[PDB]
Design a protein around this ligand. Structure first.
Ligand SMILES: Nc1nc2c(ncn2[C@@H]2O[C@H](COP(=O)(O)OP(=O)(O)OP(=O)(O)O)[C@@H](O)[C@H]2O)c(=O)[nH]1
Ligand SMILES: Nc1nc2c(ncn2[C@@H]2O[C@H](COP(=O)(O)OP(=O)(O)OP(=O)(O)O)[C@@H](O)[C@H]2O)c(=O)[nH]1
Ligand SMILES: Nc1ncnc2c1ncn2[C@H]1C[C@H](O)[C@@H](COP(=O)(O)OP(=O)(O)OP(=O)(O)O)O1
Ligand SMILES: Nc1ncnc2c1ncn2[C@H]1C[C@H](O)[C@@H](COP(=O)(O)OP(=O)(O)OP(=O)(O)O)O1
Ligand SMILES: Nc1ncnc2c1ncn2[C@H]1C[C@H](O)[C@@H](COP(=O)(O)OP(=O)(O)OP(=O)(O)O)O1
Ligand SMILES: Nc1ncnc2c1ncn2[C@H]1C[C@H](O)[C@@H](COP(=O)(O)OP(=O)(O)OP(=O)(O)O)O1
Ligand SMILES: [Mg+2]
Ligand SMILES: [Mg+2]
Ligand SMILES: [Mg+2]
Ligand SMILES: [Mg+2]
Lengths: 732, 733
């Protein structure tokens, strides 16, 4: 009959105090039972119970009641969690003054001191009025767990929470626009805060947990190209180590490395194979990882016509010996038009070493016409070392390993340059990143501190389609998103001189979208029927237009990027000009915006950023806005994920009214409907799209997916101009 | 009635007299050889239409199979037969062409360096041709010629064409090394050095034999790299390794400075992930240039025993465990000092520290044993410093256990490597070794692959053939030839890394060893285990070090001492005879036979051209050329059998006919106590270290298993007599 207070005092138990708290968390909720929570909670009560354990008891009780029938329990248990977190950080419900909060935290060394230098005490009072702490009640239960675990500033030793959700949002906006003139500074701070607090703009994990702290490591996407020399490989290795220490994803292009047996220095020595060097890359990636599990991940890229391509495709399978296996990395095979042609004609594919075929590698990315000329020229030459393999067998081996592992990716390099914001003659795209959504120009290094090399970096973000009521809201959101990320480029640090060159030179951005599945449900569309084709075209048009429009107006203000002349935009080329013309057979939606006026505006003033749009996967940042993971359809109406505090349940947004409007992953007939949508997106997307292929063994005879079906969807994707292919999800 | 096929494609009646004529020429001066026996086994294999080249290779293989204990001279019969065919492959006839005519032809083909025709005139080539005695090719053993044809002789690696003979190799190596010498003495040094290597007095390493005359400049075969505790250093070390394993060099890695798992980074901004993930990155850097990750570059990694993760690093080679905590394709050397052995004898505990948490403990561990014991006990009594306690008996047992199972877990006594060292521990201490643990040179970590402040230790090797000399005073002539040649190579070879060039040009370190030591003891009727060779060893290695120092000292008078000579103990007038382990006086009473005091005053005044000179390395390739016993190690058998591409190669111990009972085989030895004592005596004069092997026969022990008590016994026995390092532990199966 007694409870233990926080200070150590004791008082008789009061069920009215508990009932009073539950009522505050149930405001506006439907199908929620206060008594049901108390039933599951009172039975757990014991004499001498800590008051903190009481609160965590009713939280877990409400969290277990999260179901399809009553989705509003995800908000009930969330608000209960918010209440407890307020006490842990402030000792009371209402947060202290913003200025008083910052000053205390700066002394503790949790916030950066530059906040008090760029902003006066009076300006902090003004920004405090912008804050609406009641927006913390809009978080889902899964969202709060992500906040407490990853985003919120806390003591990693004791577990003490030091801040709340709204202080995070308002200070991220403060830091990014800290260098803006006072005339417009506080105005941008409020507008950007309202965007992120109302879940209109989703920010990556390193940004949410970083941009207010003394740290300056915000790079989470790294692309490195390796040259064919010991000096380049050593430089690449050192470059990887530097970035995996900052927990960044690495994209390695090691296609230039010559094949096994190739002569060195005219025959003074002979090559020992690419595999020993791939192992050296892997250990460089896993150098700062406890053991050899999880940690830094990396994706290695190589052309299909490589001589050792038969050896590189089978690096991930569990069989075989360690001598011919490099399992802890992902791989992406680079394919162009000529390869698919040999597949359709059922002819042969000739394998060459990039050191034996002059200019063949360069043409493979920049000029498909020149490539076919050089490829056929070297095929008829008998002096050049080569190997013949049937196109049907080669493609079968690739898709076979892609089926078993699910981590063998495909990049159509010809589409990555014919439909690209970059000039293939000046700065071609030869690779991608970890999740294959980034397509940026790269240049190999001869040293770790080489100032002539170019390491591609990219800052990410995402639009929440479920938080907007119409497409014309994107005009405001684009201005906020572009200006914020562009400011971060001058805010973050660069451990490698070559990486800073690429970042400052092109100022590349990559903004994507989340809650696409819920976005289709609101408009009553689906994936596999192709009923969302015209809607998709209308949607992503408004995205790309307003992004370019935002960057263009920014270029008028602060000037275009230094390396803008290396872009196609400088020559007046728009994404609507170089898209795959096969898309016209599956979409007839007209353009709703003035691209012609934008074209002349870009030709004149330029763009602040070389790239702007890129569709990345979001598993962490999506749960914050309670959104569907990126563009992928949900596997179930309620996702179940075990955690440290128990089982976390997350319900799809507005399940109450759209339970039949949703289309689950395994309710889909095939991938043809999905790929068509991806291709339409690619028409406006500057870079690439992390598209997943899905297969259900039960939907096929003998419980096995036929090879003919794999090649069918593969050719289908290429037909509609799909640049890259990510995961291949196989149902168990 | 049978016919053979000539080289041109012609055909001729079989002629057994032509074959018998060849065999007689190859059997001149040989004993207990039967020509008819060879012809009996050869004629039966003959078929109609046989190529004349197949005929020659048939009588060679026939004579090679007759190599036995009863008739050891068959190793010279088959050898001379092999020489005959090699003469035909390169010259098209028996007698080699003129030296000048040969060089010109080879330079045009791009097989020889063009600088030979630039540094020497046609007249000077004619003079050097007179030095050449092509009849010395008949002094090679069968195993030697096979090594020549395979590794040393300049050849086309594609077609397999041989382009030269044995004598042209020797005379041109001498020509290149002494090419920069003044004309007044140049050709004089060329002849003397040629006579030394052709008569097998001086043995040269593989990269020198196969390199010094060709356009290449890669002769570095020994690399020592120290890794610092930073991302910049590890990346630099990794890049440094790759460049040298590409040149097929042995690597010595010092990664003891790397902080332990859990250690805070930048005040706690991040936490360390362990030394093991970085050791894996080193291994792939080592095996980067290997056709599979096997044959290529090997490396030995070093770490102190008092390291915090020493329990995890000791078990990296065993077949057990998962890949997450195993790095099997590298060798390891545990660094031990006096204080560690002290805790072992008293049966106390050893405290484990992270080198980042104990200021100056790492430096004192090598430079100051007195300061170390002060700091070690001081930090042991501190409770604020993170530590772990383990029993000394358990820790040493774990080390020797892995050394027993793998045989590649090595031991380096760091205190002996600095108290008895040619270097000042306060200025340039020795913190590591190389692949075979015979090299002990100062090193400094790099912050970049092209750092000019770092120091990568390189060393050029060589060996004296004790079985080829008649007396120890012959070493005086051989030392002058050996030292001057290797010192000239230092300015001849290239350096892919600036830090390596600094160490090479700064100290000019050399490492000359010995071969045919087992045969050397047999001639004097001595043995290993009885300690009857103790006084002989003391006399022998004294003459070695003395003549080496004397040669380098007079060279310093001629061309100046090394730039970093002031950092040596020799500069302060300290000799190896001053800092040796005083426990050696109980096992050897042989007096000094040379004037060390006159040498002492000569070094203080003029200095030494080289910081180091003596180092006993293992020799398996260079030894077979001189038909010598492998280094200082005793032979496992009277006749060694080793399979090859052309069949089974048999090699008989030198002068088996007269010394069959004088020899003491490896497994005929009672224990290691006799062997270690000899090694300890050698260390008294040797500048660097000695690749000493420990041997154990399970059959000589009860229950067929070697006890832990015996392993620790020999370990303490070795340390007692000042043994610096321990190499292989050969266990008979
Ligand atoms: N929604 C809401 N929650 C509040 C408010 N005031 C406090 N809380 C939260 O409700 C919980 C209990 O608050 P208290 O005011 O201390 O009430 P109590 O613990 O039942 O009673 P006391 O013995 O007076 O402390 C804590 O998690 C507070 O953060 C409020 O005005 N609104
Ligand atoms: N030791 C020695 N070997 C010789 C001499 N002359 C030739 N040889 C070697 O003996 C082998 C046979 O030499 P040839 O002169 O060609 O004699 P042949 O092959 O029996 O006769 P032909 O049919 O005339 O060639 C070759 O390996 C020669 O190198 C010599 O004077 N001394
Ligand atoms: N006397 C009580 N009996 C039962 N439950 C109580 C009692 N007082 C508070 N609770 C409930 C209310 C919340 O759901 C939960 C946590 O309350 P909380 O306010 O954080 O602790 P506290 O009241 O002991 O400290 P504080 O002095 O900081 O308010 O406990
Ligand atoms: N010793 C070696 N063993 C195996 N592979 C090697 C070796 N040396 C270099 N390689 C690899 C690394 C590179 O991929 C390639 C050689 O390229 P590089 O380092 O630029 O040498 P190089 O410039 O001297 O000669 P090349 O004219 O052939 O490029 O072969
Ligand atoms: N007619 C022969 N019948 C049998 N053996 C022969 C005959 N002629 C030479 N031999 C032996 C001598 C050697 O042991 C071996 C190789 O002879 P070799 O001289 O190298 O080849 P070759 O005589 O066919 O060509 P070349 O014209 O270059 O001398 O064959
Ligand atoms: N993110 C990381 N994860 C794991 N290990 C790391 C990481 N960063 C560095 N290390 C390793 C490399 C070094 O051995 C050690 C840190 O030393 P160093 O690279 O010099 O960093 P530092 O100079 O910035 O800080 P410190 O003051 O700790 O030396 O830990
Ligand atoms: Mg309370
Ligand atoms: Mg090159
Ligand atoms: Mg002949
Ligand atoms: Mg540091």
């Amino acid at each position: 009959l007694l409870v233990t207070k926080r200070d150590g005092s004791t008082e008789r138990i009061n069920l009215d105090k508990i009932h009073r708290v539950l009522d505050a968390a149930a405001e506006g909720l439907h199908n929620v039972s206060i008594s049901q929570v108390e039933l599951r909670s009172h039975i757990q009560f014991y004499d001498g119970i800590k008051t903190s354990d009481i609160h965590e008891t009713i939280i877990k009780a409400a969290a277990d009641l999260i179901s399809r029938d009553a989705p509003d329990y995800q908000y009930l248990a969330a608000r209960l969690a918010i209440f407890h977190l307020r006490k842990k950080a402030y000792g009371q419900f209402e947060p202290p003054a913003l200025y008083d909060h910052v000053v205390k935290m700066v002394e503790m060394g949790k916030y950066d001191n530059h906040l008090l230098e760029d902003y006066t005490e009076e300006e902090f009072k003004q920004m405090d009025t912008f804050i609406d702490h009641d927006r913390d009640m809009t978080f889902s239960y899964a969202a709060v767990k992500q906040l407490e675990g990853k985003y919120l500033v806390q003591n990693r030793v004791t577990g003490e929470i030091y801040e709340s959700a709204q202080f995070l949002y308002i200070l991220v906006a403060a830091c990014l626009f800290s260098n803006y003139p006072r005339e417009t500074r506080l105005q941008y701070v409020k507008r950007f805060y309202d965007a992120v607090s109302t879940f209109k703009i989703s920010l990556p994990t390193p940004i949410m947990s970083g941009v207010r702290t003394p740290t300056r490591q915000f790079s989470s996407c790294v692309l490195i190209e390796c040259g064919d020399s010991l000096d380049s490989i050593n430089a690449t290795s050192s470059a990887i180590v530097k970035y995996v220490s900052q927990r960044a994803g690495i994209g390695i292009n090691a296609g230039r490395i010559r094949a096994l047996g190739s002569p060195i220095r005219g025959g003074e020595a002979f090559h020992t194979g690419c595999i020993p060097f791939y192992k050296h890359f892997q250990t460089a990636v896993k150098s700062c990882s406890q053991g050899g599990v999880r940690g830094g991940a990396a994706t290695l890229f190589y052309p299909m016509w490589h001589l050792e391509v038969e050896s590189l495709l089978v690096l991930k399978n569990n069989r075989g010996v360690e001598g011919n296996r490099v399992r802890h990395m992902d791989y992406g095979v680079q394919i162009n038009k000529l390869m698919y042609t040999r597949l359709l004609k059922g002819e042969d594919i000739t394998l060459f070493s990039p050191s034996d075929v002059p200019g063949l590698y360069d043409a493979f990315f920049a000029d498909q016409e020149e490539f076919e000329r050089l490829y056929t020229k070297y095929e008829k030459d008998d002096s050049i070392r080569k190997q013949r393999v049937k196109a049907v067998e080669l493609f079968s081996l690739m898709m076979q390993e892609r089926a078993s592992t699910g981590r063998i990716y495909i990049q159509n390099v010809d589409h990555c340059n014919t439909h690209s914001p970059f000039d293939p003659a000046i700065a071609p795209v030869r690779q991608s990143n970890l999740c294959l959504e980034i397509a940026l120009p790269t240049k190999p290094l001869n040293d770790v501190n080489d100032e002539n090399g170019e390491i591609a970096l990219c800052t990410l973000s995402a639009f929440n389609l479920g938080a907007i009521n119409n497409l014309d809201e994107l005009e405001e959101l684009a201005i906020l998103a572009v200006r914020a990320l562009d400011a971060l480029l001058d805010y973050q640090d660069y451990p490698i001189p070559a990486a800073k060159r690429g970042a400052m030179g092109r100022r590349t951005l990559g903004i994507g979208v989340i809650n696409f599945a819920y976005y289709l449900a609101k408009h009553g569309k689906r994936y596999s029927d192709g009923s969302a084709n015209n809607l998709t075209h209308k949607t992503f048009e408004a995205i790309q237009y307003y992004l370019l429009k935002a960057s263009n107006e920014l270029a008028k203000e602060q000037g275009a990027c230094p390396w803008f002349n290396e872009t196609t935009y400088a020559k007046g080329i728009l994404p609507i000009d170089t898209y795959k013309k096969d898309l016209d057979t599956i979409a007839n939606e007209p353009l709703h915006y003035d691209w012609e006026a934008l074209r002349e505006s870009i030709k004149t003033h330029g763009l602040r950023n070389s790239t702007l749009s890129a569709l990345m996967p979001s598993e962490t940042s999506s749960q914050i806005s309670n959104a569907t993971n990126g563009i992928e359809p949900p596997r179930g109406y309620v996702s179940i994920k075990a955690s440290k505090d128990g089982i976390l349940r997350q319900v799809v947004p507005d399940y109450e009214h759209l339970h039949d409007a949703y289309e689950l992953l395994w309710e889909m007939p095939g991938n043809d409907g999905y790929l068509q949508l991806v291709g339409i997106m690619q028409k406006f997307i500057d870079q690439s799209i992390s598209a997943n292929t899905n297969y259900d063994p039960s939907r096929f005879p003998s419980g096995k997916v036929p090879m003919q079906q794999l090649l069918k969807d593969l050719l289908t994707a290429y037909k509609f101009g799909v640049k890259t292919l990510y995961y291949q999800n196989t149902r168990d």
